[PDB]
A paper describes a structure:
[name] from the Gram-positive soil-dwelling bacterium [name] is one of the functionally best characterised members of the [name]/[name] family. The DNA-binding sites for [name] are cis-regulatory elements with a length of 16 base pairs and are termed [name]-responsive elements (dre-sites). Gene repression by [name] is abrogated by several effectors such as, for example, GlcN-6-P. In addition to the regulation of the N-acetylglucosamine-related catabolic genes, [name] also participates in global processes like cell development and secondary metabolite biosynthesis. Members of this family share a common N-terminal winged-helix-turn-helix (wHTH) DNA-binding domain (DBD), but display different C-terminal effector-binding and oligomerisation domains (EBD).
While full-length [name] encompasses a homodimer in the asymmetric unit, [name]-EBD crystallised with only one monomer in the asymmetric unit and forms a homodimer with a crystallographically related neighbouring monomer. In contrast, β-strand β* is present in ligand-free full-length [name] and as a consequence, this ligand-free structure displays an ‘upwards’-directed positioning of the DBDs. However, in the case of ligand-free full-length [name] the DBDs are ‘upwards’-directed despite the fact that the effector-binding pocket is empty. The effector-binding pocket extends across both monomers in ligand-free [name]-EBD and encompasses a total solvent-accessible volume of about 440 Å3 (220 Å3 per monomer). This contiguous pocket becomes segregated into two individual pockets once β-strand β* is formed in each chain in ligand-free dimeric [name], however, without reducing the size of the individual pockets (about 260 Å3 per monomer). At a first glance, the overall positioning of the DBDs in ligand-free full-length [name] resembles that observed in NagR in complex with potential effector molecules. However, also in this case, the centres of mass of the DBDs are shifted by about 13 to 15 Å between both structures. Interestingly, the overall pairwise orientation of the DBDs in ligand-free full-length [name] resembles that previously observed in the crystal structure of isolated NagR-DBDs in complex with palindromic dsDNA. Thus, binding of [name] to DNA with ‘upwards’-oriented DBDs is sterically impeded when assuming that [name] binding to operator DNA induces a similar conformational distortion in the DNA than NagR. Taken together, these data suggest that the crystal structure of ligand-free full-length [name] represents a DNA-binding incompetent conformation.
Author numbering:
A (entry chain A): 22 to 251
B (entry chain B): 20 to 250
The structure:
Amino acid sequence: PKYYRLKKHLLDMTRTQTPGTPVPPERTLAAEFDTSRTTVRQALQELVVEGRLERIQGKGTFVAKPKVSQALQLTSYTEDMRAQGLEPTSQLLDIGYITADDRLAGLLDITAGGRVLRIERLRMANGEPMAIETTHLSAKRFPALRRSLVKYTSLYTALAEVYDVHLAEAEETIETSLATPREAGLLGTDVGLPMLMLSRHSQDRTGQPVEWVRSVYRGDRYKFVARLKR
Amino acid sequence: RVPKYYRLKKHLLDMTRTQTPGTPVPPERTLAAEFDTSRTTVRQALQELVVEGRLERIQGKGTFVAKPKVSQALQLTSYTEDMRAQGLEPTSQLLDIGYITADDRLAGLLDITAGGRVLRIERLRMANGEPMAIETTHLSAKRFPALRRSLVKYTSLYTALAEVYDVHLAEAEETIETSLATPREAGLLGTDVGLPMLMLSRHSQDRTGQPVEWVRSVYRGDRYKFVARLK
């Protein structure tokens, strides 16, 4: 009751206020509406996750820009950021070989203990981290892939030119996830901010598995768009 | 500390990979005592696992190892067949219906004059009796004046649209994002209030390129996920 109108005014204070506007202090809001101070957290955290507010860990919480959009599709992260007026940067967090547990093997259609190239990228937009993306490929199926990536910006450019392998279909899973400590750290958010967790099974033009990708997108700043028929 | 979070989460994880669904998790206070870790940490690890779909919270009962999340293909077509595949049977329950006054965005979506009346429908979707989602459809009252009376005579909003009007969903744009369960939502779904949801916004067009519906929906993030086929 006291909660709804609170949310309603706050929701209406976005819409119109431009990003950067500081949100009134949580303890001020509790009195300005004679509501409990936890009822204020709730309303605010909803509006952070719903993307109208944004928490800056040193500074505070402010009216936010709309969430960044990306199409549910095998497509360019760079082209989509740019189309929205955002400079896209990436950062190679790690790249190394590992050995699959039995299921990563099931995914990659390789033997337990099989060697796997792993790649972790931090995706940025205007220099603000948005996602962490971890890609797994069968090292044996792609003998010297890492060494070849030196001379390439796009992993999928590398696979097409060098291995004559093109992504042709993917099964993709979208679900919720809380930001783990390691995740929150790389992304500069709270533990555990709600996340969009994407899992991608990709197969090429002759139908064999190419990669398995595990990705978490900031739930406060990100959304995905799908376009459907009939 | 940090190690304690890892060890507690490693442990419960292994429990989920080696015990059958339904296997009961000790209550939070037991875990804190057995792991000599703050209740904060225990709640966090528990919460990560529930949202990931590994553990399931049941309000009056407790936490258990879970069956996997319910999956639904992103597609205009049948919610029902896919549900029946995974071993669930879908049922719905009309929660509310009536007319409301459109805001400017709603008017923009539905292509009407702000203040124009909007038929609003609200259903609760369950799987094996268990609440999964709240689905809220918005249609232009001016465009479909006869629609609301029609509904009682049809199993589906869309056959109604196809029957009374010659109106068919041709295309749609769907947005997926994160949301926290509001108190009304948590109430109707039988979940906690802070629960991460998958919020689905749908904007549908008929064959002639005209807006038909705007649908806002929430799926409980602990029991639910979406699958898309990309090509």
